[PDB]
DNA sequence: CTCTCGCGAGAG
DNA sequence: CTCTCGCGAGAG
């Protein structure tokens, strides 16, 4: 799984966080999106609910890599809240 | 309100987030941090309970300016994050 | 305390 | 859709 420049190239470049909207997009369905978190883990506020099945973390970490080669001055721990960020604003 | 350079010289400069939590704890009571947010802005889950006042919006801007002059490429928002980050810490 | 992290309101 | 930003479980 590799991540490819005609994907990059639809990608709001100016911020972070729009590169990562536009490329789970062209990467991801809607309800994809809607129906997986980053990690899989229990959110600490949900109580007896279902629990979203993970991300592959092979596609994570490739989503990862691209958006630092474009964006060096974001980090790790940035780019994994970005994606948990478009994750969480999208509707089943 | 200004930041001396003295409470900056105390403050771990690897990585912005330990700056914040170090210079955080410089500047205020782990009663005051364990009782503040950065915007006072009201939970969207907790609804019953008093609401933690904001920070000075002064200080923050402060905080932010001097951790910009050491971390160039870390954004504002980021540095906002970090802050909420090392509030939430003290709870 | 510290970090990571899924979630939500409510206004753009 | 999109953002800011507070809660809070669990492992460290």
Redesign the pocket.
């Known amino acids: 799984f590799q991540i490819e420049k005609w994907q990059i190239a639809r990608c709001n470049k100016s911020?972070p966080?729009?590169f990562i909207?536009?490329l789970?997009?062209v990467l991801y369905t809607?309800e994809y999106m809607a129906t997986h978190?980053?990690?899989?883990?229990?959110?600490?506020?949900?109580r007896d609910?279902a629990?979203?099945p993970?991300m592959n973390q092979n596609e994570v970490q490739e989503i990862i890599g691209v958006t630092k080669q474009l964006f060096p001055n974001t980090d790790?721990?940035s780019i994994?809240?970005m994606?948990?960020?478009?994750?969480?604003?999208?509707?089943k």
């Open positions: 911020k966080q729009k909207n536009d789970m997009q809607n978190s980053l990690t899989g883990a229990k959110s600490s506020t949900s609910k629990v979203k993970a790790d721990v994994r809240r994606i948990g960020q478009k994750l969480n604003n999208c509707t």
